[PDB]
PDB file of C-alpha atoms in Angstrom:
ATOM      1  CA  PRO A   1      11.384  18.446   7.982  1.00 11.03           C
ATOM      2  CA  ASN A   2      12.433  14.637   7.405  1.00  9.96           C
ATOM      3  CA  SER A   3      14.894  13.704   4.437  1.00 13.23           C
ATOM      4  CA  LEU A   4      13.188  13.586   1.064  1.00 14.96           C
ATOM      5  CA  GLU A   5      12.843   9.767   1.577  1.00 16.51           C
ATOM      6  CA  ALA A   6      10.865  10.053   5.160  1.00 14.99           C
ATOM      7  CA  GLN A   7       8.828  12.933   2.843  1.00 18.30           C
ATOM      8  CA  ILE A   8       7.784  10.157  -0.081  1.00 17.56           C
ATOM      9  CA  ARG A   9       6.814   7.663   2.538  1.00 14.62           C
ATOM     10  CA  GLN A  10       5.112   9.641   4.166  1.00 16.02           C
ATOM     11  CA  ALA A  11       2.894  11.368   1.450  1.00 15.57           C
ATOM     12  CA  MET A  12       2.102   7.778   0.397  1.00 14.84           C
ATOM     13  CA  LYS A  13       1.037   6.400   3.288  1.00 14.19           C
ATOM     14  CA  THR A  14      -0.618   9.615   4.332  1.00 12.72           C
ATOM     15  CA  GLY A  15      -2.145  10.226   0.959  1.00 14.37           C
ATOM     16  CA  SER A  16      -1.082  13.485  -0.184  1.00 14.24           C
ATOM     17  CA  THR A  17       0.003  14.907  -3.562  1.00 13.59           C
ATOM     18  CA  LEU A  18       4.078  14.707  -3.622  1.00 13.76           C
ATOM     19  CA  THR A  19       4.854  14.316  -6.958  1.00 14.24           C
ATOM     20  CA  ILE A  20       8.084  12.709  -8.664  1.00 18.01           C
ATOM     21  CA  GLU A  21       9.709  13.852 -11.114  1.00 16.82           C
ATOM     22  CA  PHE A  22      12.654  11.170 -12.650  1.00 18.59           C
ATOM     23  CA  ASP A  23      15.298  11.577 -15.161  1.00 20.33           C
ATOM     24  CA  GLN A  24      15.020   9.218 -18.043  1.00 18.24           C
ATOM     25  CA  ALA A  25      18.815   8.207 -17.437  1.00 17.63           C
ATOM     26  CA  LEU A  26      17.239   6.241 -14.985  1.00 14.93           C
ATOM     27  CA  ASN A  27      16.234   4.137 -17.732  1.00 16.41           C
ATOM     28  CA  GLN A  28      19.697   3.459 -18.452  1.00 16.98           C
ATOM     29  CA  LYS A  29      19.668   1.304 -14.987  1.00 17.31           C
ATOM     30  CA  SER A  30      18.699  -2.204 -14.499  1.00 18.25           C
ATOM     31  CA  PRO A  31      15.760  -3.350 -12.414  1.00 17.49           C
ATOM     32  CA  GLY A  32      16.456  -4.138  -8.823  1.00 18.20           C
ATOM     33  CA  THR A  33      18.225  -2.172  -6.033  1.00 20.33           C
ATOM     34  CA  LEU A  34      19.432   1.530  -6.877  1.00 21.78           C
ATOM     35  CA  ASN A  35      21.852   3.820  -5.533  1.00 21.68           C
ATOM     36  CA  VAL A  36      19.953   7.636  -6.134  1.00 22.77           C
ATOM     37  CA  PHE A  37      20.310  11.277  -5.319  1.00 24.27           C
ATOM     38  CA  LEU A  38      16.948  12.691  -4.025  1.00 23.00           C
ATOM     39  CA  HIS A  39      16.576  16.745  -4.825  1.00 24.59           C
ATOM     40  CA  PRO A  40      13.662  18.693  -3.773  1.00 23.70           C
ATOM     41  CA  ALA A  41      11.669  19.961  -7.174  1.00 24.23           C
ATOM     42  CA  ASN A  42       8.467  22.167  -6.728  1.00 25.12           C
ATOM     43  CA  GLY A  43       5.487  20.528  -5.377  1.00 26.00           C
ATOM     44  CA  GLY A  44       7.489  17.399  -4.945  1.00 22.79           C
ATOM     45  CA  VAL A  45      10.642  15.191  -5.364  1.00 23.67           C
ATOM     46  CA  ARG A  46      13.695  15.001  -7.978  1.00 27.19           C
ATOM     47  CA  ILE A  47      14.532  11.269  -8.375  1.00 23.26           C
ATOM     48  CA  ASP A  48      18.352  11.689 -10.531  1.00 22.96           C
ATOM     49  CA  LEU A  49      22.051  10.509 -10.364  1.00 20.63           C
ATOM     50  CA  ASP A  50      23.341  13.789  -9.639  1.00 17.07           C
ATOM     51  CA  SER A  51      24.922  13.936  -6.080  1.00 13.18           C
ATOM     52  CA  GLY A  52      24.678  17.724  -5.998  1.00 16.92           C
ATOM     53  CA  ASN A  53      21.984  20.497  -6.327  1.00 13.06           C
ATOM     54  CA  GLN A  54      20.715  19.608  -2.045  1.00 15.46           C
ATOM     55  CA  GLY A  55      20.982  15.659  -3.663  1.00 16.35           C
ATOM     56  CA  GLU A  56      19.872  13.016  -1.167  1.00 16.79           C
ATOM     57  CA  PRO A  57      21.612   9.786  -1.482  1.00 14.49           C
ATOM     58  CA  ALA A  58      18.968   6.832  -1.359  1.00 14.13           C
ATOM     59  CA  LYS A  59      19.373   2.868  -2.239  1.00  9.83           C
ATOM     60  CA  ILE A  60      15.821   2.592  -3.777  1.00  9.52           C
ATOM     61  CA  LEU A  61      14.592  -0.688  -5.755  1.00  7.31           C
ATOM     62  CA  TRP A  62      14.143   0.365  -9.172  1.00  6.48           C
ATOM     63  CA  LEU A  63      11.967  -1.239 -12.291  1.00  6.30           C
ATOM     64  CA  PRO A  64      13.012   1.022 -15.740  1.00  6.83           C
ATOM     65  CA  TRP A  65      10.672   0.773 -18.902  1.00  8.08           C
ATOM     66  CA  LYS A  66      11.898  -0.219 -21.893  1.00  8.57           C
ATOM     67  CA  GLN A  67       9.986   0.985 -25.131  1.00 10.08           C
ATOM     68  CA  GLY A  68       7.937  -1.342 -27.143  1.00 12.22           C
ATOM     69  CA  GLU A  69       8.340  -4.603 -24.181  1.00 12.10           C
ATOM     70  CA  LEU A  70       8.433  -5.557 -20.322  1.00 12.35           C
ATOM     71  CA  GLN A  71      10.921  -4.915 -17.438  1.00 13.59           C
ATOM     72  CA  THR A  72      10.920  -6.791 -14.766  1.00 16.59           C
ATOM     73  CA  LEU A  73      11.642  -6.499 -10.981  1.00 16.49           C
ATOM     74  CA  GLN A  74      12.686  -9.791  -9.389  1.00 18.86           C
ATOM     75  CA  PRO A  75      11.386 -10.551  -5.410  1.00 15.43           C
ATOM     76  CA  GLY A  76      14.836 -11.809  -4.704  1.00 17.32           C
ATOM     77  CA  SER A  77      15.678  -7.992  -5.142  1.00 20.79           C
ATOM     78  CA  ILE A  78      13.512  -7.066  -1.662  1.00 21.65           C
ATOM     79  CA  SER A  79      14.835  -7.474   1.274  1.00 22.34           C
ATOM     80  CA  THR A  80      15.572  -3.782   3.182  1.00 24.28           C
ATOM     81  CA  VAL A  81      12.401  -2.504   5.099  1.00 25.97           C
ATOM     82  CA  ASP A  82      11.376   0.510   4.407  1.00 26.71           C
ATOM     83  CA  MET A  83      13.498   0.813   1.390  1.00 24.70           C
ATOM     84  CA  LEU A  84      10.880   2.729  -1.857  1.00 24.18           C
ATOM     85  CA  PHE A  85      10.519   1.227  -4.938  1.00 25.51           C
ATOM     86  CA  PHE A  86       9.498   3.068  -8.262  1.00 24.65           C
ATOM     87  CA  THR A  87       9.133   2.356 -11.601  1.00 22.05           C
ATOM     88  CA  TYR A  88       9.386   5.115 -14.358  1.00 20.29           C
ATOM     89  CA  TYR A  89       6.201   6.950 -15.375  1.00 23.12           C
ATOM     90  CA  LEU A  90       3.629   5.207 -17.489  1.00 22.75           C
ATOM     91  CA  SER A  91       2.396   6.391 -20.556  1.00 26.28           C
ATOM     92  CA  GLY A  92      -0.100   4.494 -21.321  1.00 26.94           C
ATOM     93  CA  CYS A  93       2.060   1.287 -20.258  1.00 25.88           C
ATOM     94  CA  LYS A  94       0.751  -1.319 -17.658  1.00 21.12           C
ATOM     95  CA  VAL A  95       2.096  -2.323 -14.341  1.00 22.22           C
ATOM     96  CA  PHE A  96       0.870  -5.673 -12.965  1.00 22.16           C
ATOM     97  CA  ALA A  97       2.581  -6.906  -9.492  1.00 17.88           C
ATOM     98  CA  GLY A  98       2.274 -10.545  -7.653  1.00 20.45           C
ATOM     99  CA  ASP A  99       2.485 -10.151  -3.951  1.00 18.43           C
ATOM    100  CA  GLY A 100       5.820 -11.903  -3.034  1.00 16.79           C
ATOM    101  CA  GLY A 101       5.847 -12.205  -6.732  1.00 16.59           C
ATOM    102  CA  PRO A 102       7.547 -10.107  -9.647  1.00 15.16           C
ATOM    103  CA  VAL A 103       6.828  -6.491 -10.946  1.00 16.77           C
ATOM    104  CA  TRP A 104       6.267  -5.605 -14.593  1.00 18.37           C
ATOM    105  CA  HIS A 105       6.291  -2.695 -16.150  1.00 17.57           C
ATOM    106  CA  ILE A 106       4.912  -3.112 -19.486  1.00 15.30           C
ATOM    107  CA  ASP A 107       5.312  -0.619 -22.518  1.00 15.82           C
ATOM    108  CA  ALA A 108       1.549   0.920 -23.727  1.00 12.44           C
ATOM    109  CA  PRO A 109       1.871  -0.743 -27.311  1.00 10.53           C
ATOM    110  CA  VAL A 110       2.262  -4.433 -26.284  1.00 11.60           C
ATOM    111  CA  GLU A 111      -1.132  -6.301 -26.378  1.00 11.20           C
ATOM    112  CA  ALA A 112      -2.325  -8.453 -23.779  1.00 10.10           C
ATOM    113  CA  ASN A 113      -1.833 -12.128 -25.230  1.00  7.14           C
ATOM    114  CA  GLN A 114       1.700 -10.816 -25.987  1.00  6.06           C
ATOM    115  CA  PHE A 115       3.081  -9.627 -22.804  1.00  5.59           C
ATOM    116  CA  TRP A 116       1.106 -11.978 -20.157  1.00  3.97           C
ATOM    117  CA  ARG A 117       3.121 -14.892 -22.616  1.00  2.00           C
ATOM    118  CA  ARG A 118       6.254 -13.030 -22.126  1.00  2.70           C
ATOM    119  CA  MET A 119       5.792 -12.881 -17.914  1.00  2.00           C
ATOM    120  CA  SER A 120       4.362 -16.326 -17.963  1.00  2.00           C
ATOM    121  CA  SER A 121       8.067 -17.650 -18.860  1.00  2.00           C
ATOM    122  CA  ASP A 122       8.365 -15.931 -15.354  1.00  2.00           C
ATOM    123  CA  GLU A 123       9.833 -19.078 -12.497  1.00  2.00           C
ATOM    124  CA  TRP A 124       6.690 -17.571 -10.550  1.00  2.00           C
ATOM    125  CA  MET A 125       4.147 -17.135 -13.327  1.00  2.00           C
ATOM    126  CA  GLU A 126       5.316 -21.325 -13.776  1.00  2.00           C
ATOM    127  CA  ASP A 127       4.501 -21.880 -10.486  1.00  2.00           C
ATOM    128  CA  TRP A 128       0.830 -20.473 -10.212  1.00  2.00           C
ATOM    129  CA  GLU A 129      -1.154 -23.517 -11.199  1.00  2.00           C
ATOM    130  CA  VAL A 130      -4.161 -23.228 -13.022  1.00  2.00           C
ATOM    131  CA  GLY A 131      -6.819 -23.173 -11.299  1.00  2.00           C
ATOM    132  CA  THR A 132      -5.051 -21.149  -7.901  1.00  2.00           C
ATOM    133  CA  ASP A 133      -5.217 -18.401  -6.926  1.00  2.00           C
ATOM    134  CA  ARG A 134      -2.293 -15.508  -6.543  1.00  2.00           C
ATOM    135  CA  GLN A 135      -2.800 -11.462  -4.992  1.00  2.14           C
ATOM    136  CA  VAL A 136      -2.417  -9.821  -7.501  1.00  2.00           C
ATOM    137  CA  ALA A 137      -1.891  -6.151  -8.640  1.00  4.98           C
ATOM    138  CA  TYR A 138      -3.301  -4.502 -11.887  1.00  2.44           C
ATOM    139  CA  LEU A 139      -3.060  -1.178 -13.456  1.00  6.06           C
ATOM    140  CA  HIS A 140      -3.608   0.151 -16.870  1.00  7.86           C
ATOM    141  CA  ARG A 141      -5.231   3.308 -18.768  1.00  6.31           C
ATOM    142  CA  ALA A 142      -9.113   3.654 -18.635  1.00  9.56           C
ATOM    143  CA  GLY A 143     -10.033   4.079 -21.894  1.00 11.12           C
ATOM    144  CA  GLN A 144      -7.168   2.148 -23.911  1.00  9.93           C
ATOM    145  CA  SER A 145      -7.947  -0.678 -26.273  1.00  7.74           C
ATOM    146  CA  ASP A 146      -8.881  -3.961 -24.357  1.00  6.79           C
ATOM    147  CA  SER A 147      -6.123  -5.749 -26.908  1.00  7.92           C
ATOM    148  CA  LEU A 148      -3.631  -3.971 -24.963  1.00  6.70           C
ATOM    149  CA  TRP A 149      -4.931  -4.760 -21.028  1.00  7.68           C
ATOM    150  CA  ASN A 150      -7.545  -7.024 -20.706  1.00  9.64           C
ATOM    151  CA  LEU A 151      -6.332 -10.563 -19.164  1.00  9.18           C
ATOM    152  CA  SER A 152      -9.833 -11.915 -18.070  1.00 10.37           C
ATOM    153  CA  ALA A 153      -8.977 -14.857 -20.481  1.00 12.84           C
ATOM    154  CA  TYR A 154      -6.125 -15.692 -17.918  1.00 13.81           C
ATOM    155  CA  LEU A 155      -7.215 -13.902 -14.739  1.00 15.99           C
ATOM    156  CA  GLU A 156     -10.651 -14.392 -12.610  1.00 13.19           C
ATOM    157  CA  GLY A 157     -11.396 -11.942 -10.122  1.00 14.42           C
ATOM    158  CA  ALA A 158     -11.756  -8.100  -8.994  1.00 15.39           C
ATOM    159  CA  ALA A 159     -11.358  -5.701 -12.420  1.00 15.14           C
ATOM    160  CA  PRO A 160      -8.300  -3.359 -12.871  1.00 19.14           C
ATOM    161  CA  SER A 161      -6.923  -0.464 -11.460  1.00 20.06           C
ATOM    162  CA  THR A 162      -6.899   2.246 -14.184  1.00 23.74           C
ATOM    163  CA  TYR A 163      -5.291   5.595 -14.169  1.00 23.83           C
ATOM    164  CA  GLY A 164      -6.675   8.675 -16.615  1.00 21.07           C
ATOM    165  CA  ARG A 165      -9.779   8.452 -18.465  1.00 20.01           C
ATOM    166  CA  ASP A 166     -10.150   8.534 -22.798  1.00 19.77           C
ATOM    167  CA  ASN A 167      -6.785   6.684 -23.256  1.00 21.66           C
ATOM    168  CA  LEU A 168      -5.494  10.038 -21.422  1.00 21.76           C
ATOM    169  CA  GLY A 169      -2.948  10.536 -18.810  1.00 17.78           C
ATOM    170  CA  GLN A 170      -0.031   9.439 -16.893  1.00 17.08           C
ATOM    171  CA  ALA A 171       0.754   7.601 -14.017  1.00 17.48           C
ATOM    172  CA  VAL A 172       3.082   6.718 -11.066  1.00 18.93           C
ATOM    173  CA  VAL A 173       3.844   3.979  -8.987  1.00 18.36           C
ATOM    174  CA  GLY A 174       6.242   3.280  -6.401  1.00 18.08           C
ATOM    175  CA  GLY A 175       6.143   1.103  -3.158  1.00 17.11           C
ATOM    176  CA  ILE A 176       7.408   0.845   0.293  1.00 16.46           C
ATOM    177  CA  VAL A 177       9.321  -2.856   1.487  1.00 17.46           C
ATOM    178  CA  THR A 178       7.843  -4.560   4.367  1.00 16.81           C
ATOM    179  CA  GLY A 179       9.813  -7.354   4.405  1.00 14.65           C
ATOM    180  CA  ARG A 180      11.352 -10.379   1.948  1.00 11.42           C
ATOM    181  CA  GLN A 181       9.919 -10.931  -0.972  1.00 10.34           C
ATOM    182  CA  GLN A 182       7.438  -8.020  -0.288  1.00 11.10           C
ATOM    183  CA  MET A 183       5.882  -4.868  -0.702  1.00  8.67           C
ATOM    184  CA  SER A 184       2.631  -2.730  -0.211  1.00  7.68           C
ATOM    185  CA  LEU A 185       1.808  -0.485  -3.491  1.00  3.10           C
ATOM    186  CA  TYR A 186       1.481   3.146  -3.953  1.00  2.00           C
ATOM    187  CA  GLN A 187      -0.160   5.547  -6.870  1.00  2.00           C
ATOM    188  CA  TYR A 188      -0.596   8.447  -8.302  1.00  2.00           C
ATOM    189  CA  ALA A 189      -1.920   9.799 -11.514  1.00  2.00           C
ATOM    190  CA  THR A 190      -1.340  12.930 -13.661  1.00  2.00           C
ATOM    191  CA  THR A 191      -3.839  14.631 -15.727  1.00  2.00           C
ATOM    192  CA  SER A 192      -3.618  17.999 -18.104  1.00  2.00           C
ATOM    193  CA  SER A 193      -5.310  19.111 -15.148  1.00  2.00           C
ATOM    194  CA  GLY A 194      -2.722  18.011 -12.873  1.00  2.00           C
ATOM    195  CA  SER A 195      -1.769  15.128 -10.311  1.00  2.00           C
ATOM    196  CA  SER A 196      -3.842  13.711  -8.178  1.00  2.00           C
ATOM    197  CA  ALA A 197      -2.527  12.433  -4.636  1.00  2.00           C
ATOM    198  CA  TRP A 198      -0.807   9.166  -3.132  1.00  2.00           C
ATOM    199  CA  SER A 199      -3.207   6.147  -3.020  1.00  2.00           C
ATOM    200  CA  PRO A 200      -3.034   2.212  -2.171  1.00  2.00           C
ATOM    201  CA  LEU A 201      -2.375   0.453  -5.520  1.00  2.00           C
ATOM    202  CA  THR A 202      -4.642  -2.045  -4.156  1.00  2.00           C
ATOM    203  CA  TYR A 203      -3.609  -6.432  -4.531  1.00  2.00           C
ATOM    204  CA  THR A 204      -6.867  -8.048  -5.044  1.00  2.00           C
ATOM    205  CA  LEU A 205      -6.963 -12.249  -5.512  1.00  2.00           C
ATOM    206  CA  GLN A 206      -6.925 -13.605  -8.548  1.00  2.00           C
ATOM    207  CA  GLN A 207      -7.444 -17.249 -10.005  1.00  2.00           C
ATOM    208  CA  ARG A 208      -5.725 -18.200 -13.342  1.00  2.00           C
ATOM    209  CA  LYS A 209      -7.724 -19.902 -15.577  1.00  2.00           C
ATOM    210  CA  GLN A 210      -5.463 -20.935 -18.479  1.00  2.00           C
TER     211      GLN A 210
END
């Protein structure tokens, strides 16, 4: 086969099943570029900081998870075509991505009004004038209380993407860099019944209401 990095990009683009196992230690690494090791794993790839065990070095874009709040990947970090992007598992978490803007990973318990207020301090948000449009990918867990995810007071457009059902399930989000400050996003989900294949995580047109 090709490199593990190539195998992940191919699985993403082909819509194949190839799971990702993240070492929890990655959450001690700040958002932005990160040198990791990829390893063979059962039905997928393990991403960690271990140089041994058939490890293949890769430089990725990384977005950690932090309990009770959000983390942000800035678009100025995004440069190298074909570089992979990952965030840590979504365990009831939300991910919001502006096309050409930041990516946010918001922990499950943070209320939508609270995390929107925190996001909105970002320069890209301050530049998003009321009554104007952006392309936005937004992913939340189906069956979670609306309080924790619903942005309909703020955004006009397509419904969010969802993972899971009945407030149960986990998701993986990653991406492939396509140019300066730009990525294509991909996702899969994990049920008590196993993991799905990769699929696109789509940007849709959203107008800022207020």
